[PDB]
Assembly symmetry: D2
Homo-oligomer: 326 residues x 4
């Protein structure tokens, strides 16, 4: 059977509360060993080996843990047949895209979490973790980029996102759909991401100590410019706008970001709306302002790529093409 | 036929006399309140709107507000809390330009008037009418950046559907709206200042710090997951909450409630959970909450009733 | 604590004492009505169920029926029309086996009892509780073949959501249910025979002809699109409708209403449109309709009220 | 500019009523010329040429019009750059899969319809037809199988289905998602169907006068066996079961179909549930009864493939593998 390495980072999957029937819980508590041992059918499918990288709620996820992950995967690739990453749900979609863009290891990387704590009634984490291992074990799982496996479904790291605050079925690829569904330890793959991932990207984080500073500002009625001016004041390399409708900006925020674009700060228009693309050739003349439209990337996802794009270039045409390729 | 007033505010739907069939169903009069893209919607326009409706209630049988799509869901919930008129107030926009192939606005307009003119639309609170669907102003939101079908009530579903100029209503909002709220805006010309801050991995506390240093009355967090806060942001908001800033935890996730009794002790920090109100909606309620009270506990009870 | 009765009927959820925490919230007693996979659910079981509930109403504070997922949506709507008891009747199943990794049944059961035991669950009609959600028995249906999240109220949304053993209710069904229906099943031991036929390109009229030649009391069509009929099937049903067979046009499409005033003159052929009732749900109502009347017009008014 | 051939078959796209504001209408009325001329921007993107094959509502769609379509496309391929097929909505998802399995022409085939009649206020048909032509005109549209284009979205012929009786946004690929979204006459493709289509299939309808007879039976509580016995009585080559939950059968229907399988009639278990697969290795021992599980194919779609499978083989193992390949 295949050798699978579990890289644990915390999350509710490793979370606990004092009642099986109360919602209250704390994160970053339980070690990887408890998790493996809570799925004594893992023996049937793989030779599992658990390593604890960090133990944090993914709400406190950060650039350094991302860097740690990518270098460790890229370093350890020759040592295992596959990777599963146990992680909190909240920022799983950010980390999954980060690794999707930066892992060069040609073996599957499957992220997994849980929407109920390990201690809860009908906790979702055991079966999720099993299906993660199945997916990382499956030869057909290779050359699909970095994956998330939640609720019996294999979802590509780019499109994958939370749709609901609490639903075990929360994770969906809301724009282009899942890669495959899982039944009885077997996967019927009908799709693969077309945008470039993993070893077909330029992004090489092996020698990086940090990542460019990119912030996110929200739009809404009577929006303040003070958040945008804060980030510009602090010399942020990039700002992503979580726009209204199709990436549109409140006039005060617009004005601030327009000025910023012209002094070298990279500016990406995304949208606070949960599906569909922030397009070029709508209400914002991007070329004029030196803005970038995010396409289907939501604000937190557009942040990931803009940060990586800023390790290669500061030219907004080069960054726009990156946002059309990756 | 009923008398129906259009209150125009701009939006893509204007960019009456193109829809001659409205004569079949109502006597309409149009009145320009403002003319702006709703990405630039603001407190003053909202205040004008609520006041106008409240004042002109008796003089018409229902209201249709033409509006941009970008922020219609916000203007909708504001009016849903502030309109005291018991006659239908119906909002409508268009996702395609007035001059484009298969423009949605005409039939959208048509159906908004059908809804405004239906006696059973009464006492359901302020409504959004888009894509043959009647949607309550609290839960209504955009789902897609460009889809004509974008407006959905994503947590509790629509009030009804519109076919052949009739509506089969199957639901009404339970949360208190319009004349059952204590919010009264008739004497106000500014609203408490309330900002939104975004959470994500390695989130800067800079936005939150900048609203705190401006003396904002409230801050809505667009949390990760079930309304969770990146550590720097958590730290800044925890301070804000005891230093005279109201603090609502909402979510960047498009559906489900930001709940109490998960990972954050709201009571200890003095925070409020938004329930199913997304960050822009939680803002609206928060502004109006702040006209009644500054106590977190009292603000939590408002977020629980409305 | 309230008294809550489980009425067991089989299903995957059994394949009480595994859920010791139910003692925290109720005093339960269990009673085996039948033990079958719900793919074999039938009229007799339905009749037993309605009678049992109606009779034992006064003796308990609410009801939880454990059931297969396959046809729970049918049993749900049957009971929603026939239960006269005003106390909560809550249905629950499980999409994963009782012995499987992360089985859903325990917490499903738990939450069904929370719902059965909530005083605000009263007078909302018969309910399905699945995946932390309360769902009205009329609109509730499967969306997915294996997903734990499969049960949704696909046209009008859920009644509420369940978190930390409390429900925030935001909606109630408007269509008349339970004690507001004229259906009374207390003296019946068979139901009018009603069949379903499927439409698609080059559809055979053979199924429809075979139910007609058996003297069926009704036929539900699973139409294409907005309840449209392949020509052969149309021809057979048109004949049936004037020869003493009730004919309801529903749709194979999972959402939206099968409407009047589209391409079919229902009045001319003597047909009924199902509105939002899918074919299996339209069947239920049709059966009960046929215990009151055989006139199409009267049957259309029932499909419009319930 | 590209040469595009419009093959008209009727539908509401070519439907009309006497009021712009009433729902009533009749189908199979308006010719292809009115349609082209109702989109006077078609000039900007292609040299269009309209041919009327039939003029029917798609509720009266049938095997012979399918056969006509496939032979005509396969015959005329060298004469145009692309095909658009105007068709009713109701059975578009059946015809799109039929052609997906039987077109050998290596140029795009794009189906399009409309949920409001041509005469209606804000009728959807003009813009749909424009986006159909854009899609058929796009070089990137090739090697994706037969497509449907509705509401600004490009959907693969296999997964595409109606989700709502009346919504202009009704058509979705409910299991695996769309191929691409359309903005301002341009398409950003991120997916292609993995299952075998067009010239990578065995199905060759060039010399076929008819198709094997396959019927569909519905399951529900207290289901009658009389529909199933009718089709078996008439010597049907195949029966598809629109099962309950995961392809399950009411015991009377089961019994009839079990008997039928054993006397040579092909039997496919599908599901009346609108998403997710009818799986092997659940509550039905398929191998034992000589049944076939449909996977993600819904009843009407499983009918299409079972009919084509029955032009090649009657062996239920061969048909099961076809249902795993196509
Ligand atoms: N806050 C948790 C939520 C979860 O994992 O379910 C996390 O993302 O770490
Ligand atoms: N930006 C426009 C979008 C629209 O209405 O379609 C507005 O909201 O004013
Ligand atoms: N066939 C089973 C499916 C389940 O309950 O999960 C039943 O309905 O009895
Ligand atoms: N019955 C029509 C419906 C439509 O096209 O909108 C058809 O499929 O032909």
């Amino acid at each position: 059977l295949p050798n699978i390495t579990i890289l644990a980072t915390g999350g509710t999957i490793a979370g606990g509360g004092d009642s099986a029937t109360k919602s209250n819980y704390t994160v970053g508590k339980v070690g990887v060993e408890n998790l493996v041992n809570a799925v004594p059918q893992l023996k049937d499918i793989a030779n599992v080996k658990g390593e604890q990288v960090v133990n944090i709620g993914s709400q406190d996820m950060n650039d350094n843990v991302w860097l740690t992950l990518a270098k460790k995967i890229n370093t350890d690739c020759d040592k295992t047949d596959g990777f599963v990453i146990t992680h909190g749900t909240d920022t799983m979609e950010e980390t999954a895209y980060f690794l999707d863009l930066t892992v060069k290891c040609d073996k599957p990387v499957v992220m997994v979490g849980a929407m109920r704590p390990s201690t809860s009634m009908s906790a979702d984490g055991p079966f999720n973790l099993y299906n993660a291992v199945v997916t990382a074990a499956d030869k057909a799982s290779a050359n699909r980029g970095v994956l998330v496996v939640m609720n019996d479904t294999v979802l590509d790291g780019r499109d994958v996102t939370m749709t609901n605050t609490t639903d075990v079925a929360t994770f969906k690829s809301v724009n282009y759909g899942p890669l495959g569904y899982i039944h009885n330890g077997k996967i019927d793959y009908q799709r693969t991401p077309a945008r470039k991932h993993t070893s077909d990207t330029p992004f090489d984080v092996s020698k990086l100590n940090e990542l460019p500073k990119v912030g996110i500002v929200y739009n809404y009625a009577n929006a303040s410019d003070l958040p945008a001016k804060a980030l510009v004041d602090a010399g942020y390399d990039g700002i992503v706008s979580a726009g209204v409708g199709n990436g549109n900006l409140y006039k005060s925020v617009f004005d601030t970001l327009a000025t910023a674009a012209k002094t070298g700060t990279a500016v990406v228009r995304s949208s606070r709306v949960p599906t569909g693309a922030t397009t070029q050739d709508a209400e914002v003349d991007d070329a004029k302002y030196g803005f970038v439209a995010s396409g289907t990337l939501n604000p937190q996802k557009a942040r990931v790529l803009l940060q990586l794009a800023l390790t290669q270039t500061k030219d907004p045409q080069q960054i726009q093409q990156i946002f059309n390729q990756y």
